[PDB]
Copies of this chain bind each other. A is one copy, B any other.
Amino acid sequence: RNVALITGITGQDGSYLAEFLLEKGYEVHGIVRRSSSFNTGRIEHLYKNPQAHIEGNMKLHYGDLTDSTCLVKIINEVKPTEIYNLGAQSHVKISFDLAEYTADVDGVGTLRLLDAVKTCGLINSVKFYQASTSQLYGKVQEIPQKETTPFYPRSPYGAAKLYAYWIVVNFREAYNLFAVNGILFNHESPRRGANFVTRKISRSVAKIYLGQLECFSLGNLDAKRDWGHAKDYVEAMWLMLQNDEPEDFVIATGEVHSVREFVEKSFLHIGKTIVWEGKNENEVGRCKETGKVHVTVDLKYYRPTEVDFLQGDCTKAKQKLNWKPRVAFDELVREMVHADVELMRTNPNA
């Protein structure tokens, strides 16, 4: 009997994780927010009959990480063996203007879910996965970063996720809950939110190729990231819960690239060579072959306290879990641009 409860099931990771666990024969339950319109686009294919919306081995429940009673009711009805806490306000720029909501969902909501496990009498039966993050390293104190690199958060998102990391450790130590922190670095896919930098670039490049757009604006072009594929990373979350002891792990590729490089490589897939001119907020990217400007900079996309550089060392996970990433940067860029060209050609309003 394998019964999983996923908070954040409608998100990028929750959609891939649901597919992965269904293939292994799990009964999969998800918590979905009430919405005035459709919000299940990433998972609508996982109904027994998607046309008629008839559920099979995936069951959805209305709820929210800010409603204490709804979490107790769902956990008591489902009695899960595994809980994956993926639900969050996950956008770092948005966290600067929505700091209080971000604290309530990403920080206090982690405690609410842990308290619901305890209220339901499941502290000694459930295994709990927390969605921790390389944003905890912020202004990095070591390069590369690994499990024993000290934390230095740099946004209201990072501060909220730091609370969540430590409240999970305290339940593990105080009550012997099997609970783990996955310290995941950036991971993307064709299902990535449109407001994250990689998907923003692939969508915009697609629209330019098709004549639906002339130019778009970015923020800090010199930021450097470790980018993997979400489909690979959800496997690591499951492996952490199969481990004999509840241990925390970094999950990453170890390879670093700039935003500028993501832009350059994306445009090469549509036959265009970007050459940069200007400085600071006045920098632009121009196509060599046509002379047209396609990329500009706008300070509205900068963050007040930036995270300049991330590079993860996942040696501990490779040794203990036998996890390895499959998709590297060049393949990720290609896949994202190709998927967005097909999407935008089929539907220009997408």
| A interface residues (Cβ-Cβ under 8 A, vs B) | 8, 10-12, 34-39, 41-42, 44, 50-53, 62-64, 66-70, 72-73, 76, 89-91, 94, 96-101, 103-104, 107-108, 111-112, 115, 118-119, 150, 153-156, 158-160, 162-163, 166-167, 169-170, 173-175, 193-194, 207, 212-213, 304-305, 348-349
* B91 in contact with A34 (CB, 8 Å): yes
Given contacts A51-B348, A104-B108, A174-B305, contact A97 B119 (CB under 8 A): no
How many angstroms from the CA of A160 to the CA of B212 in the assembled complex?
Answer: 45
Task: List, in ascending order, chain B residues with CB within 8 A of A68's CB.
Answer: 68-69, 100, 112
* A51 in contact with B349 (CB, 8 Å): yes
* B103 in contact with A52 (CB, 8 Å): no
Task: List, in ascending order, chain B residues with CB within 8 A of A97's CB.
Answer: 62-63, 70, 73
How many angstroms from the CA of A10 to the CA of B37 in the assembled complex?
Answer: 8
Task: List, in ascending order, chain B residues with CB within 8 A of A158's CB.
Answer: 166, 170
* A150 in contact with B153 (CB, 8 Å): no
Given contacts A62-B94, A66-B104, A349-B44, contact A166 B173 (CB under 8 A): no
* B111 in contact with A100 (CB, 8 Å): yes
Task: List, in ascending order, chain B residues with CB within 8 A of A108's CB.
Answer: 100, 103-104, 107-108
Nearest-CB distance from A187 to chain B (Å)? 14
Could you give 8 example pairs across A and B, Cβ below 8 Å? A35-B39, A36-B90, A50-B348, A153-B169, A156-B170, A173-B304, A174-B305, A175-B304
* B89 in contact with A115 (CB, 8 Å): no
Which residue of B is nearest A204, CB measured?
B52
Q: A70's contact among B51, B98, B111, B167, by CB below 8 Å, is which?
A: B98
Nearest-CB distance from A256 to chain B (Å)? 23
* B103 in contact with A163 (CB, 8 Å): yes
Q: A305's contact among B64, B103, B173, by CB below 8 Å, is which?
A: B173
Copies in the complex: 4
* B154 in contact with A69 (CB, 8 Å): no
Task: List, in ascending order, chain B residues with CB within 8 A of A115's CB.
Answer: 69, 99-100
* B34 in contact with A89 (CB, 8 Å): yes
Q: A72's contact among B10, B119, B150, by CB below 8 Å, is which?
A: B119
* B34 in contact with A10 (CB, 8 Å): no
Which residue of B is nearest A13, CB measured?
B36
* A170 in contact with B305 (CB, 8 Å): yes
* A63 in contact with B166 (CB, 8 Å): no
How many angstroms from the CA of A103 to the CA of B349 in the assembled complex?
Answer: 36
How many angstroms from the CA of A77 to the CA of B12 in the assembled complex?
Answer: 33
* B107 in contact with A107 (CB, 8 Å): yes
* A94 in contact with B34 (CB, 8 Å): yes
* B100 in contact with A69 (CB, 8 Å): yes
How many angstroms from the CA of A311 to the CA of B305 in the assembled complex?
Answer: 33
Nearest-CB distance from A88 to chain B (Å)? 9
Interface centre among A62, A98, A104, A163 (most CB of B within 10 A): A163
Nearest-CB distance from A320 to chain B (Å)? 22
